[PDB]
Design a protein around this ligand. Sequence first.
Ligand SMILES: C[C@H](c1ccc(N2CC[C@H](NS(=O)(=O)/C=C/c3ccc(Cl)s3)C2=O)c(F)c1)N(C)C
Lengths: 52, 228
Amino acid sequence: RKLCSLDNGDCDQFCHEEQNSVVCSCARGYTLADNGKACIPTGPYPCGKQTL
Amino acid sequence: IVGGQECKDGECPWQALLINEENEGFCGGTILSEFYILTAAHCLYQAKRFKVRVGDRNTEAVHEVEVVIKHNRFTKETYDFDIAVLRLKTPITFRMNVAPACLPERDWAESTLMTQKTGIVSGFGRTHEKGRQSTRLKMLEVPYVDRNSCKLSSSFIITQNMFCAGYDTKQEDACQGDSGGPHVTRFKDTYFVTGIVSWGEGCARKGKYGIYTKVTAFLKWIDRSMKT
Ligand SMILES: C[C@H](c1ccc(N2CC[C@H](NS(=O)(=O)/C=C/c3ccc(Cl)s3)C2=O)c(F)c1)N(C)C
């Protein structure tokens, strides 16, 4: 297990492998954090989150 | 939903309910955005006119539909391509119990979501094969089923646009009235749409599974439908 196969490449959401390295990305309504791995909601009620 | 548990406050906020003229729910749907609902093509034959209800966990806001986009390849015979997108007349206001599920990117969904052990199905359908619709929204964790086991268990052809989920012996399944509703998969506390409740040979029948429309097979179709 390497890259996206290893714990999803440390990405919160989408993981892709480009040129032998991990590239993370996020669903609409999220912005990729500065660390290039976390996904930050842009608003209230981002997709896929329970409203708890 | 046969078996499973009641959806508690805020747990299934992407659930939508299609209701006929007589305000009775007959199918589910999944909220995709403020204007768009995902549902099953076959649901579109169960009522002449219908509206979409969101937010109510206990049947005891309503949105009219502007455009119905039905997959042109749907066939009543095989239930292949059992998918439709609805554009509402007015946008949904997100709030407690009302929020969209995420659409995943296709390859990632196939390698990361469809390979998880389970997904979650929800709806206001019957709680027993013979029964009245549930007044409470229910949810049920359902294991993904191996494609070969799936085809072996089935009296009908399972196409590549479909997948199986559920239990072989344990008596828990989606049921009548749940069709068109969400199958979602959790990944790091985010829920992605992965299926549409489509069909089953009865509810929770021994040696049978629930059959779902594979959303990954239609991601581009969905994206295009939400632009026009
Ligand atoms: C493959 C397709 C087909 C097979 C079986 C069915 N049936 C027969 C009964 C069943 N109706 S139902 O109880 O409202 C649906 C139950 C479900 C159980 C699990 C699901 Cl996922 S959906 C159902 O969907 C069907 F509607 C369609 N063809 C034969 C029309």
